[PDB]
Amino acid sequence: VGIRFCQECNNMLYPKEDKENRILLYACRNCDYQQEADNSCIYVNKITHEVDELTQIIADVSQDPTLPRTEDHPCQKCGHKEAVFFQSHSARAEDAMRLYYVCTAPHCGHRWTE
């Protein structure tokens, strides 16, 4: 799935089929280094590109005065009442008016979507 680099020249490896043993390899084109492929998957493309934006949401966002917050939804970890909520804030999000929530109070940063 991910990209891995050569251990000699730190260039980009490329996948190559081993014709004898039928084992996927990654070989650097600028040298002779070769490493067997462990993942066995190469090119994955998510056309719907459904990605949880909770990975793209920063905890620091809880410090923004310009965002709205409610005391209705408490946090799961610490049970803090303040929770600052906001929409996708992303282009090409398909159609999503879902509210994402970020916990206020220091260092918790827990994010839930309801």
Binding site: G2, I3, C9, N10, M12
Partner: peptide, 27 residues
């Protein structure tokens, strides 16, 4: 010169796969 260093400057987080896939064709 090294591809890894160029991507270190371009892609600040190597763990994210989508941006690496974006940069691959230009490499």
């Amino acid at each position: 010169v090294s591809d890894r260093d160029i991507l270190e400057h371009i892609i600040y987080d190597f763990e994210d796969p989508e941006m690496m896939e974006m940069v691959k064709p230009s490499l």
